[PDB]
């Protein structure tokens, strides 16, 4: 009933899953729109390293605390440190779940498995030790609060302010009607979006499939003959795929002056 063996098994699986995604990211390989959108977005990097690598430190941390024999400072600190680390991992994961449901409007199976593994860690840590109550409910909010504040703070400080070029080009494309045709699940459309940053709000955009993947595309895009995403229509011309700000400036007739 009281066991940390399950913690080693769940943290073992977690360490493996999150290390594959770290290997996947660093070797530039794709993992199995779906995960492609999720794992290639901003948010998939945290403090200059992959977000999975942060999960690697956590999953290996809980594994180490479970494996070590009761050695200096272990028996005393093992179980309060397990509650601290796992609570931070549950809190981070709820923000990860929030991003998928609310902001990315999609899911990834590797990411979903991590949530269930971390939720499993949360249940076993609560039901595998005796701390006789109101302390744990309070210690959870404290760790969660500190986790969320730091996490949200890191991601807010992450995305840089848009360049003058991004702000100017967007407003110019807005004036000439330079429209981008794409999808919200579309990973390449996210790449294009991230080149403008916050300045993308100005950019005229048509959502080609509001219903999602596997559903017939919207009328507006079908009338324009859009076959793949993203697709730009600028001054009668058609450009397929992700284009740099420099290339979109040339296409729009936006002056790139360096003299």
Swiss-Prot record:
Membrane topology term: Multi-pass membrane protein
Annotated phenotype, changing residue 108 to A/S: Abolishes enzyme activity, also with dithiothreitol as in vitro reductant
Chain residues that bind a quinone: 38-44, 89-100
Effect of residue 35 to A: Abolishes enzyme activity, but not with dithiothreitol as in vitro reductant
Activity-regulation annotation: Inhibited by ferulenol.
Record-annotated membrane-spanning stretches: 5-25, 46-66, 81-101, 107-127, 136-156
Disulfide bonds: 108-111, 186-189, 208-221
GO MF term (any one): quinone binding
Spans annotated as Thioredoxin-like domain: 163-259
Principal location listed in the UniProt entry: membrane
UniProt topological domain (Periplasmic) ranges: 26-45, 102-106, 157-259
GO CC list: membrane
Subcellular location: Membrane
Annotated site residues (Important for the reduction of the redox-active Cys-130 and Cys-133) in this chain: 35, 186, 189
Entry-linked SUPFAM superfamilies: Thioredoxin-like
Protein role: Thiol-disulfide oxidoreductase that catalyzes vitamin K-dependent disulfide bond formation in periplasmic target proteins.
Name of this chain's protein: Vitamin K epoxide reductase homolog
């Amino acid at each position: 009933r009281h066991s940390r063996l399950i913690l080693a098994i769940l943290a073992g699986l977690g360490s493996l899953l999150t290390a594959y995604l770290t290997y996947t990211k660093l070797t530039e390989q794709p993992a199995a729109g779906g995960c492609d959108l999720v794992l290639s977005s901003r948010w998939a990097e945290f403090l200059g390293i992959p977000t999975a690598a942060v999960g690697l430190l956590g999953f290996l941390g809980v594994l180490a605390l479970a494996v070590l024999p009761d050695l200096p400072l272990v028996k005393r600190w093992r179980w309060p440190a397990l509650f601290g680390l796992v609570s931070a991992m549950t809190a981070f994961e709820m923000y990860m779940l929030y991003l998928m449901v609310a902001v990315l409007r999609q899911f990834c199976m590797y990411c979903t498995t991590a949530i269930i593994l971390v939720a499993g860690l949360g249940l076993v840590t609560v039901l595998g030790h005796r701390w006789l109550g109101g302390k744990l409910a309070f210690s959870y909010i404290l760790v969660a609060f500190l986790t969320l504040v730091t996490t949200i703070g890191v991601y807010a400080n992450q995305v840089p302010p848009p360049s003058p070029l991004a702000v100017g080009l967007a407003a110019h494309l807005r004036q000439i009607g330079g429209t981008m045709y794409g999808a919200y699940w579309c990973p390449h459309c996210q790449d294009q979006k991230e080149l403008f940053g916050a300045a993308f709000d100005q950019v005229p955009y048509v959502e080609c499939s509001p219903n999602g993947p596997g559903t017939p595309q919207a009328q507006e895009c079908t009338e324009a003959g859009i076959t793949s995403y993203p697709t730009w229509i600028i001054n009668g011309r058609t450009y397929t795929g992700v284009r740099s700000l420099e290339a979109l400036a040339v296409a729009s007739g936006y002056p790139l002056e360096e003299g």
